[PDB]
Design a protein around this nucleic acid. Structure first.
Ligand SMILES: [Mg+2]
Ligand SMILES: [Mg+2]
Ligand SMILES: [Mg+2]
Ligand SMILES: [Mg+2]
Ligand SMILES: [Mg+2]
Ligand SMILES: [Mg+2]
Ligand SMILES: [Mg+2]
Ligand SMILES: [Mg+2]
Ligand SMILES: [Mg+2]
Ligand SMILES: [Mg+2]
Ligand SMILES: [Mg+2]
Ligand SMILES: [Mg+2]
Ligand SMILES: [Mg+2]
Ligand SMILES: [Mg+2]
Ligand SMILES: [Zn+2]
Lengths: 120, 79, 50, 158, 205, 45, 161, 71
RNA sequence: UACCGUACUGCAAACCGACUCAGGUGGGCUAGUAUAUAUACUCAGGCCAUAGAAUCAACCAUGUUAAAGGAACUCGGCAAAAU
RNA sequence: GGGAUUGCUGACUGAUAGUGCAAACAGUACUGUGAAGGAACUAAUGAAACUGGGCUAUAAGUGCGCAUUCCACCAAUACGU
């Protein structure tokens, strides 16, 4: 079970697991609180895998660390690594899930919202 | 002229020049090894006779879902 | 007696003299901080960090 | 965007002693980050089958607790955590000399390193997997051994 | 050209480009005028737009393999001409010609031949500027299809104040008392429930 | 339980940036440090 | 004569500067006939320290110039040997000049870019410990006759019965 | 104890005559390896000579001797 | 039974003096001849990296010895010697 | 009086000038215990001092990008495209 963060386990073999995109806010507004809860846990475990995998390689993230490591902007073949692109999509997914949850919390009427702002 | 107004203006001035700690912030970051700065942890107890006692209701509990295995939503949406 | 070494370093005295709270404790210290802000200094006090 | 505020040493000295909260809620939607460091390749083969190591070291953020790392690993990854040891690290200083020579200096965000000692899951405990020699002979051999050479200087050729 | 770049007033206020990529063009000025080429890429810069054509403005590029001295390899490469230095070739007389943005029927805007009868057979066709489709190469693991991602799972019909939806499970009722389908057994295993149980069993035995 | 060439100072050790351990850090700077071994009651030098 | 051009402006400026000094070297001081030359840039020595050795090899033939450089313990003599060996390599393999007739007809030392430093005099006064640099230009002409070797070649201690 | 005026280029050149080095009128050259040194100095491989091929010494036969090796 | 400190340096090339500055910098532990933490040699331990190489300059600094005298020197036995 | 947008405004300046700053991070580096002081650095071209050697001894065209006015759709009252 430490294999989950230990490696992609599909990257040592020359195959790409994730060939897709990250979640958007309008799709995430249509999912229930339980579905958002499960997606949040799956996305955080994916975030740990991607951070570990780009920590084994010495590649930056966020595009602000790239200026710190003296790596050139765009023309470096480092922003094009699969783990960095997946990491940016996973951060977008987690940020959008947080935004949807506060929107639903601000969309309430009674003291239930004071409890809705205690689990987010 | 008030004390809170001066601190708020200081923080608004510090909102600019923020991000990955450049310049004077590189030296100022080493204050955490000089004056015992308390980090952003949540306290779980209190000292009574010098022995720390963790209050059991303040221990961390994580409400993980029943199964995240064969759950039909992945972190990635197909294009 | 050789001079030049008037600066004897001490973190307690540095924070207790030129720190934020002694600057805020008095009115003229608060206008000192206000004109530090109006000049545009990046470091407001000797003990500021993040 | 709202970000990290400045803190002041006199302010933390004056408004000191953070109090414990009155109620702790079970944490739905947690915001906690872990990553492994580099493993030896034989440890990587040790993880590839049966998914276990006795000692794994992690990078975290400095706002975490040994209880939080142990609870998170036990809750999410199904491990048995025996003990956690945490080290606070400063960021690395970075130098990125500019178009005019300025010496632009950066500092990475501070991180906490956890040393997590694990425990064999259930019934699989055999994978701890380790003649004699006298310790008097060990010390007597390590006393007649040649000394380590003094460290060469970076300009010195040997 | 001018070497300042930022002093230049930004041109192309309305974004319309008469030259597109992959089309035959005539070089008007420079070391090789009278020659023709196919546009490989247009650099759409508002201040200094360039056009790279097929094998015409050839200058030797010194590609620097990283080294302090004279270790490098040299490759001939098409240097970028200015956007103003090129003009489209009409397919009839081989001379450069001005492209106009004529509107045909259906409200669409096309590129005509600059004639007093701008209609069909004078339109110069413009190719599309995008082809990066990840739709081919989908269905990998850790992905979800669009139809699955657009389920209307959320409904406000439930979620009403339900302080007594506990079901009485040691701490799986604490979360729906603080407002929850099923906690994992491993999560409840993390907060150990056996420190008092061992003392109770030892006292009983 | 100890690597004595390291103890006498004639060999490199695990965590070679320490070079002078306190009472704790003797256990983890030892080159023959086994994680699977149990941890002693006092953790001496 | 270079009908082609470089891609970047920096390389083109450098190449044009190179052709301008190849014009200035021809039909100027000497020039004319085929000449092997070298330019050793940024020697980590002062101009006086290099000029101490350069006054010994001025006008000599090539073998006794190598002899005069190889018979002194100076640090500058090794750099002068490097410059003379580079000039000899250009003259013999890049050009087609005959050996054993090469004369060191032009050698001189020019200034280099300095690295300014600081020295700490007493009573608070500053000083300097500037690190000096220099350049070497060596021109090896070919004479019409093999010249007088100027230093008698004797047998070593090894050549003994 | 202090110069009253600035030294001219001609006066400086005249004063710097002691700093110049005299040329050596003899050199010992090895015909094989082309090495150069004084006639009183060994410049073969035992000394510093990475170009030595051993042809500098043309004869060295000494097989016979008898002694007690102290061990 | 949490949080912070734990590397390295700390009579010093890493602190305070613009410096790799002959200056300034707190507390504690210690073996023998031996007897006091003084003195000479030494234990444990550490060091002989930050200009090197020979040689009979004058002269300068710091000392050893000096025949017969002895403050006669000098503003003043100052400085040395002496107990 | 003061704080921000616009100036088919300038016989204002054009990198030792103009703000202290035209710049990857200027109220910065750096100086000072502190209040406080406070730089240099655009892109090409490459003058002199300086130091070695040598010697002497056709006020035009052609392309692009806009602005003005025509036109035809216009919110139909300042132009909207
Ligand atoms: Mg004193
Ligand atoms: Mg001072
Ligand atoms: Mg600790
Ligand atoms: Mg001392
Ligand atoms: Mg001083
Ligand atoms: Mg000292
Ligand atoms: Mg002694
Ligand atoms: Mg020495
Ligand atoms: Mg006597
Ligand atoms: Mg100025
Ligand atoms: Mg200037
Ligand atoms: Mg001014
Ligand atoms: Mg310039
Ligand atoms: Mg000139
Ligand atoms: Zn030889």
């Amino acid at each position: 079970d430490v294999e989950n963060q230990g490696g992609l386990a599909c990257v040592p073999k020359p195959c790409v697991s994730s060939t897709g995109r990250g979640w958007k806010v309008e799709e995430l507004r249509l999912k229930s609180w339980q579905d958002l809860h499960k997606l949040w846990y799956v996305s955080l475990k994916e975030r740990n895998l991607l951070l570990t995998e780009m920590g084994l390689k010495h590649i930056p993230k966020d595009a602000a660390h790239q200026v710190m490591r003296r790596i050139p902007v765009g023309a470096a073949s480092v922003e094009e690594d699969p783990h960095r692109l997946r990491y940016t999509e996973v951060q977008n997914t987690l940020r959008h899930i947080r935004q949807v949850l506060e929107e639903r919390a601000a969309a309430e009427l009674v003291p239930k919202l004071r409890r809705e702002m205690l689990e987010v | 002229i008030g004390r809170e107004a001066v601190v708020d203006l200081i923080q608004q001035s510090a909102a600019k020049q923020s991000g990955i700690r450049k310049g004077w912030q590189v030296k100022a970051a080493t204050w955490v090894k000089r004056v015992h700065v308390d980090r952003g942890d949540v306290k779980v107890g209190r000292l009574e006779g010098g022995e720390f006692q963790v209050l059991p209701h303040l221990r961390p509990r994580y409400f993980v879902p029943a199964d995240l295995d064969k759950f039909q939503l992945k972190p990635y949406v197909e294009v | 007696g050789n001079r030049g070494n008037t600066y004897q370093p001490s973190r307690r005295k540095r924070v207790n003299r030129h720190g934020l709270e002694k600057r805020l404790s008095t009115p003229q210290g608060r206008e000192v901080l206000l004109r530090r802000l109006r000049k545009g200094r990046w470091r407001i006090t000797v003990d500021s960090f993040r | 965007e709202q970000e990290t505020r400045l803190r002041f040493v006199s302010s933390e000295w004056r408004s000191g002693r953070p109090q414990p909260p009155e109620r702790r809620i079970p944490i739905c939607f947690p915001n906690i980050t872990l990553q492994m460091m580099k493993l030896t390749p034989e440890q990587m083969d040790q993880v590839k089958e049966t998914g276990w190591l006795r000692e794994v070291a992690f990078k975290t953020t400095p706002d975490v607790t040994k209880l939080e790392i142990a609870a998170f690993l036990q809750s999410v990854y199904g491990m048995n955590v025996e003990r956690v040891s945490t080290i606070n690290y400063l960021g690395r200083r970075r130098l990125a000399i500019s178009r005019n020579g300025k010496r632009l200096w950066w500092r990475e965000d501070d991180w906490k390193k956890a040393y997590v000692i694990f425990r064999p899951p259930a019934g699989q405990e055999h994978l701890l997997t380790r003649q004699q020699r006298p310790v008097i002979e060990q010390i007597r051999e390590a006393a007649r051994a040649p000394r380590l050479p003094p460290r060469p200087y970076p300009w010195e050729r040997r | 050209p001018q070497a300042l770049y930022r002093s230049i007033q930004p041109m192309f206020k309305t974004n319309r480009w008469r030259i597109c990529r992959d089309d035959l063009v005539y070089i008007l000025s420079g070391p090789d005028k009278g020659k023709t080429g196919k546009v490989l890429e247009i650099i759409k810069d508002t201040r200094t737009p360039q056009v790279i054509v097929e094998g015409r403005n050839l200058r030797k590029k010194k590609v620097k393999t990283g080294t302090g001295p004279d270790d490098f390899f040299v490759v001939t490469m098409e240097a970028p001409l200015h956007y103003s230095q090129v003009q489209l070739v009409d397919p009839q007389t081989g001379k450069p010609m001005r492209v106009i943005f004529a509107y045909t029927a259906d409200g669409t805007k096309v590129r005509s031949r600059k004639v007093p009868n701008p209609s069909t057979a004078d339109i110069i066709a413009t190719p599309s500027e995008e082809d990066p489709d990840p739709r081919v190469g989908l269905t990998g693991p850790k992905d979800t299809s669009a139809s699955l991602a657009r389920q209307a799972t959320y409904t406000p019909s439930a979620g009403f104040p339900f302080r007594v939806r506990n079901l009485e499970r040691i701490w799986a009722e604490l979360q729906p008392d603080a407002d929850x389908x099923x906690x994992x057994x491993x999560x409840x295993x993390x907060x150990x429930x056996x420190x008092x149980x061992x003392x109770x069993x030892x006292x009983x035995x | 339980k100890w690597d004595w060439k390291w103890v006498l100072g004639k060999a490199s050790g695990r965590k070679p940036a320490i070079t002078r351990p306190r009472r704790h850090q003797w256990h983890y700077c030892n080159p023959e440090y086994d994680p699977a071994a149990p941890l002693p009651e006092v953790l001496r030098s | 004569p270079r009908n082609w051009m470089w891609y970047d402006a920096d390389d083109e400026r450098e190449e044009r500067r190179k052709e301008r000094q190849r014009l200035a070297w021809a039909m100027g001081p000497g020039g004319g006939e085929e000449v092997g030359a070298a330019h050793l840039m940024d020697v980590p020595q002062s101009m006086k320290k290099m000029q101490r050795i350069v006054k010994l090899v001025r006008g000599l033939p090539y073998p006794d110039a190598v002899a005069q450089c190889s018979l002194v313990p100076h640090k500058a003599a090794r750099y002068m040997l490097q410059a003379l060996e580079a000039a000899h390599a250009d003259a013999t393999e890049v050009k087609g000049l005959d050996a054993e007739r090469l004369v060191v007809g032009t050698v001189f030392v020019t200034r280099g870019a300095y690295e300014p430093g600081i020295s700490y005099h007493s009573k608070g006064r500053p000083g300097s410990k500037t690190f000096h640099r220099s350049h070497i230009r060596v021109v090896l002409n070919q004479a019409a006759e093999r010249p007088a070797p100027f230093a008698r070649i004797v047998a070593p201690l090894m050549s003994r019965r | 104890a202090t110069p009253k005026k600035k030294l001219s280029l001609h006066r400086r050149g005249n004063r710097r005559v002691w700093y110049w080095l005299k040329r050596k009128t003899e050199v010992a050259k090895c015909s094989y390896c082309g090495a150069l040194s004084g006639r009183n100095q060994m410049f073969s491989g035992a000394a510093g000579n990475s170009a030595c091929t051993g042809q500098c010494v043309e004869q060295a036969p000494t097989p016979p001797a008898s002694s007690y090796p102290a061990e």
